């Protein structure tokens, strides 16, 4: 098995030691490109005859690591011509032997002749690969391309350029080995919007995503960002209005190239919701919180500050067109729900203290001061014993 | 200052149409003072786009191609050659162009000076080894110089750069030969190396 | 080795001390200077050594094509022998750091066509070169290329 094929490969790939000393004297040629390959494939196929289905692949895993163990690249090319016809006979499938070459660590970005030979060979044996195998090989080829740094010496650049045309042939939709819908998913998984890919990928992938431009136009909804719901206490929150609580975007189907307006934070929807009263049930729905679980969201304390400082300018502009300025009702609203927010302690108080200290440092707008400590008094009076004086 | 503000904002894109709209708008915005942006883009911006190593990591498939098209739209138009305020602000200022660019048709016209200076930078990029995105940018440079050229805008080609394009690997070699009677023999030599 | 441990123990006790050079001075300086006496009144050189003892029957020079001043080098061979007939000139390929690596040679099957003699020359090349040992010099490949011309000429004649 492994030892018999060890002996066979040892007698096949050997450059004989006593040879090349007192040389050029025999009247005998060695076995040529056909006879030596026939002699090796006979032992290979009789070894394969006593080989089980599970043991077919693993010896292949040795075979490449023996082939990568060789150092004469003419002998390596002879072994490549051996394996080109070995998989042609059907003894080895051109689906499991493709990743065996790449899986070896000897195929790095410094064995560039081995790189060119390997990529030419897997280009040649690409015919016996299904759509799933194509999807499996493209991602490992892509990350192997990603292993090369940005700037490498240009002595062996053309040896490394072969993968670009290999992928370009793979990406050809007329042959249709695999749909491009699966092809764009892995690239988008590695390279989302606003994320630069590797410099070896070239313009083609930048064109390849561009052909998916109408598809998102199928899913495009006009004026979706400007649409807003109504705040109600009836339950049954509409799932179309819901967002992503972690980073404030709408949920998206797939990884299609959506437009820019779907990638910014929608602070306006929660702005309109929290500015109106009775924003109690659906504020937990749009943030996905059940309100009994302690999460302590840090960014959720941001907009609560950003409303309060906004509550400064509504108390600062005139406050004289009306006696209350339509502000003391909103001051009561801010006193009511902001303390309910810290009732479950999802907003830690000294963080708001330092954020207000940072925000008011620089502007110096002090006109509606009388409210500012008063609601602060509403924090101090009602929460006198639940905390220490550190806050 | 205005060019420096917008150039860094050009580096937020990954969608080719999305950056190409901005490039098309910036074409007209630069055409507001095309006579000056044809000399300040090639004067201090393009040397400032290649001096360091990591700075060409932004020069990629959408923005590098878009900027290369943007430059070649303006260059030809400046070769061909919009407000009273532009006439007002161009009166008083004087500038030593030789002090800025000592050059290592006329060779005193900054149209003939800075444009000829840029080809030295392209030769420096290509002749430098350790190929990266800079080689991609200079290969995207003149590939559109002939696309709009139905049929000299490229009269200032140095003679050493003719052999370089086949060193980095067509008909554009014959285009770069300028069909000169003195260029006839070196054109034959260049197409012999094929 | 025997009765020297005071001298060994003094230096380890006086180590990591800032007064070390002055403590040793203070304890030692007057003893020796008093009685014993007062103080006194392009291409690498590997290929340059390689081509030095190459055969004059080869006139190998650099390739006019391809890149230059880089790690990989290519040398096209010229054979001026009255004994041997005309053959294609052949071209090698040697990467950077020529010692301790196994180089290669170009491939062009259609150049050795229109004559079965040239096909036999190519088959003899594939016979002899496939058993050449690893990391050998260019003299071995040059001489195996040279002898195969006679080896095919004897079969042709």
Curated annotation (Swiss-Prot), chain A:
- What does the UniProt record say this protein does? Required for transcriptional activation subsequent to the assembly of the pre-initiation complex. Component of the Mediator complex, a coactivator involved in the regulated transcription of nearly all RNA polymerase II-dependent genes. Mediator functions as a bridge to convey information from gene-specific regulatory proteins to the basal RNA polymerase II transcription machinery.
GO CC term (a single one)? mediator complex
Q: Which family would the database say this protein is a member of?
A: Belongs to the Mediator complex subunit 23 family.
Q: Which UniProt keywords apply?
A: Activator, Disease variant, Intellectual disability, Nucleus, Transcription, Transcription regulation
Q: What is this protein called?
A: Mediator of RNA polymerase II transcription subunit 23
Keyword Transcription (UniProt) = yes
Give coiled-coil spans as residue ranges. none
Q: How does it assemble?
A: Interacts with ELK1. Component of the Mediator complex, which is composed of MED1, MED4, MED6, MED7, MED8, MED9, MED10, MED11, MED12, MED13, MED13L, MED14, MED15, MED16, MED17, MED18, MED19, MED20, MED21, MED22, MED23, MED24, MED25, MED26, MED27, MED29, MED30, MED31, CCNC, CDK8 and CDC2L6/CDK11. The MED12, MED13, CCNC and CDK8 subunits form a distinct module termed the CDK8 module. Mediator containing the CDK8 module is less active than Mediator lacking this module in supporting transcriptional activation.
- Please list the GO biological process terms of this entry: positive regulation of gene expression; positive regulation of T cell extravasation; positive regulation of transcription elongation by RNA polymerase II; positive regulation of transcription initiation by RNA polymerase II; regulation of DNA-templated transcription; regulation of transcription by RNA polymerase II; RNA polymerase II preinitiation complex assembly; transcription initiation at RNA polymerase II promoter
Q: Which GO terms describe its molecular function?
A: transcription coactivator activity
Identify the main location.
Answer: nucleus
UniProt subcellular location: Nucleus
From Swiss-Prot, chain B:
Instruction: Kindly state the positions of the motif LXXLL motif 5 in this protein.
Output: 46-50
What do we know about how this protein assembles, alone or with others? Component of the Mediator complex, which is composed of MED1, MED4, MED6, MED7, MED8, MED9, MED10, MED11, MED12, MED13, MED13L, MED14, MED15, MED16, MED17, MED18, MED19, MED20, MED21, MED22, MED23, MED24, MED25, MED26, MED27, MED29, MED30, MED31, CCNC, CDK8 and CDC2L6/CDK11. The MED12, MED13, CCNC and CDK8 subunits form a distinct module termed the CDK8 module. Mediator containing the CDK8 module is less active than Mediator lacking this module in supporting transcriptional activation.
What is this protein for, i.e. what is its function? Component of the Mediator complex, a coactivator involved in the regulated transcription of nearly all RNA polymerase II-dependent genes. Mediator functions as a bridge to convey information from gene-specific regulatory proteins to the basal RNA polymerase II transcription machinery. Mediator is recruited to promoters by direct interactions with regulatory proteins and serves as a scaffold for the assembly of a functional preinitiation complex with RNA polymerase II and the general transcription factors.
Q: Which residues cross the membrane?
A: none
Q: State the gene name recorded for this protein.
A: MED24
Q: Which residues of the full protein are shown?
A: 743 to 989 of 989
Q: Which residues form a coiled coil?
A: none
Q: What is the lineage of its organism?
A: Eukaryota, Metazoa, Chordata, Craniata, Vertebrata
Q: Where in the cell is it found?
A: Nucleus
What is the tissue specificity? Ubiquitous. Abundant in skeletal muscle, heart and placenta.
Write down what this protein is called: Mediator of RNA polymerase II transcription subunit 24
State the family named in the UniProt similarity comment for this chain: Belongs to the Mediator complex subunit 24 family.
From Swiss-Prot, chain C:
PTM description:
Ubiquitinated by TRIM11, leading to proteasomal degradation.
Q: Which domain of life is it from?
A: Eukaryota
**What conditions trigger expression of this protein?**
By 12-O-tetradecanoylphorbol-13-acetate (TPA).
Where is it expressed, tissue-wise? Expressed in all tissues examined, including heart, brain, lung, spleen, thymus, pancreas, blood leukocyte and placenta. However, the level of expression varied, with highest expression in the placenta and peripheral blood and lowest in the pancreas and kidney.
Q: Where in the cell is it found?
A: Cytoplasm; Nucleus
State its role: Component of the Mediator complex, a coactivator involved in the regulated transcription of nearly all RNA polymerase II-dependent genes. Mediator functions as a bridge to convey information from gene-specific regulatory proteins to the basal RNA polymerase II transcription machinery. Mediator is recruited to promoters by direct interactions with regulatory proteins and serves as a scaffold for the assembly of a functional preinitiation complex with RNA polymerase II and the general transcription factors. Required for cholesterol-dependent gene regulation.
Can you tell me which family this protein belongs to? Belongs to the Mediator complex subunit 15 family.
Indicate the quaternary assembly: Component of the Mediator complex, which is composed of MED1, MED4, MED6, MED7, MED8, MED9, MED10, MED11, MED12, MED13, MED13L, MED14, MED15, MED16, MED17, MED18, MED19, MED20, MED21, MED22, MED23, MED24, MED25, MED26, MED27, MED29, MED30, MED31, CCNC, CDK8 and CDC2L6/CDK11. The MED12, MED13, CCNC and CDK8 subunits form a distinct module termed the CDK8 module. Mediator containing the CDK8 module is less active than Mediator lacking this module in supporting transcriptional activation.
Identification of the protein by name: Mediator of RNA polymerase II transcription subunit 15
Upper lineage is:
Eukaryota, Metazoa, Chordata, Craniata, Vertebrata
Q: Which residues of the full protein are shown?
A: 615 to 788 of 788
């Amino acid at each position: 098995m492994e030892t018999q094929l060890q002996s066979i490969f040892e007698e096949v790939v050997k450059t004989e030691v006593i040879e090349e000393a007192f040389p050029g004297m025999f009247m005998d040629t060695p076995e040529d490109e056909k006879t030596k390959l026939i002699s090796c494939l006979g032992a290979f196929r009789q070894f394969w005859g006593g080989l089980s289905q599970e043991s077919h692949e693993q010896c292949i895993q040795w075979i490449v690591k023996f082939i990568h163990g060789q150092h004469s690249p003419k002998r390596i090319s002879f072994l490549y011509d051996c394996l080109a016809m070995a998989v042609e006979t059907g003894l080895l499938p051109p689906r499991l032997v493709c990743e065996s070459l790449i899986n070896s660590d000897t195929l790095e970005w410094e064995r560039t002749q081995l790189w060119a030979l390997t990529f030419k060979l897997v280009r040649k044996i690409i015919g016996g690969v299904d759509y799933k195998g194509v999807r499996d090989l493209l991602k490992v080829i892509l990350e192997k391309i990603l292993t090369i740094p940005n700037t490498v010496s240009s002595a062996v650049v053309q040896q490394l350029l072969a993968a670009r045309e290999v992928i370009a042939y793979i990406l050809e939709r007329n042959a249709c080995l695999l749909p491009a819908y699966f092809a764009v998913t892995e690239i988008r998984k590695l390279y989302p919007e606003g994320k630069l890919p590797h410099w070896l990928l070239g313009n083609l992938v930048s064109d390849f995503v561009d052909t998916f431009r109408p598809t998102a136009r199928i899913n495009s909804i006009c004026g979706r960002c400007s649409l807003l719901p109504v705040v109600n206490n009836s339950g049954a929150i509409c799932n179309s209005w819901k967002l992503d609580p972690a980073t404030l975007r709408f949920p998206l189907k797939g990884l299609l190239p959506y437009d820019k307006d779907l990638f910014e934070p929608q602070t306006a929807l929660l702005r309109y919701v929290l500015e109106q009263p009775y924003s109690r049930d659906m504020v937990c729905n749009m943030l996905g919180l059940n309100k009994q679980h302690k999460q302590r969201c840090p960014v959720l304390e941001d907009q609560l500050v950003d409303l309060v400082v906004y509550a400064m300018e509504r108390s600062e502009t005139e406050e004289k067109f009306d006696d209350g300025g339509t502000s003391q009702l909103l001051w009561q609203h801010l006193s009511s729900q902001l303390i309910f927010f810290v009732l479950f302690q999802f907003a830690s108080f000294p963080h708001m203290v330092l954020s207000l200290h940072q925000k008011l440092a620089g502007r110096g707008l002090i006109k509606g001061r009388d409210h500012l400590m008063w609601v602060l008094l509403q924090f101090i009076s009602g929460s006198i014993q639940k905390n220490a004086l550190a806050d | 200052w205005f060019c420096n503000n917008l150039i860094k904002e050009l580096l937020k894109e990954t969608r080719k149409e999305h950056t190409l709209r901005a490039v098309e708008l910036l074409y007209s915005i630069f055409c507001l003072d095309m006579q000056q942006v044809t000399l300040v883009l090639l004067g201090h911006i393009l040397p400032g786009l290649l001096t360091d190593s990591s700075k060409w990591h932004s020069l990629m498939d959408p923005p590098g191609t878009a900027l290369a098209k943007l430059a070649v739209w303006c260059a030809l138009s400046s070769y061909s050659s919009a407000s009273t305020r532009q006439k007002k602000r161009h009166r008083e200022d004087i500038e030593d162009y030789i002090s800025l660019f000592p050059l290592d048709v006329n060779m005193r016209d900054p149209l003939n000076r800075v444009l000829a200076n840029l080809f030295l930078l392209i030769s420096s990029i290509l002749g430098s080894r350790t190929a990266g995105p800079h080689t991609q940018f200079v290969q995207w440079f003149m590939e559109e110089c002939v696309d709009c050229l139905e049929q000299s805008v490229l009269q200032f080609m140095p003679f050493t750069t003719v052999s370089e394009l086949v060193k980095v690997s067509k008909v554009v070699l014959a285009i770069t030969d300028l069909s000169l009677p003195l260029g006839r023999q070196v054109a034959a030599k260049a197409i012999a190396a094929l | 080795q025997y009765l020297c441990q005071p001298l060994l123990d003094a230096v380890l006790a006086n180590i990591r001390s800032p007064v070390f050079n002055h403590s040793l001075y203070r304890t030692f300086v007057p003893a020796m200077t008093a009685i014993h006496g007062p103080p006194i009144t392009s291409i690498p050189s590997v290929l340059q050594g390689e081509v030095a003892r190459l055969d004059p029957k080869f006139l190998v020079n650099l390739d006019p094509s391809h890149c230059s001043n880089n790690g990989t080098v290519h040398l096209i061979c010229k054979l001026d022998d009255k004994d041997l007939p005309s053959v294609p000139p052949l071209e090698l390929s040697v990467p950077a750091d020529y010692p301790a690596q196994s180089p290669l040679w170009i491939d062009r099957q259609w150049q050795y066509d229109a004559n079965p003699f040239l096909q036999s020359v190519h088959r003899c090349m594939t016979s002899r070169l496939l058993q050449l040992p690893d990391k050998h010099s260019v003299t071995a490949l040059l001489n195996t290329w040279a002898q195969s011309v006679h080896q095919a000429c004897l079969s042709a004649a």
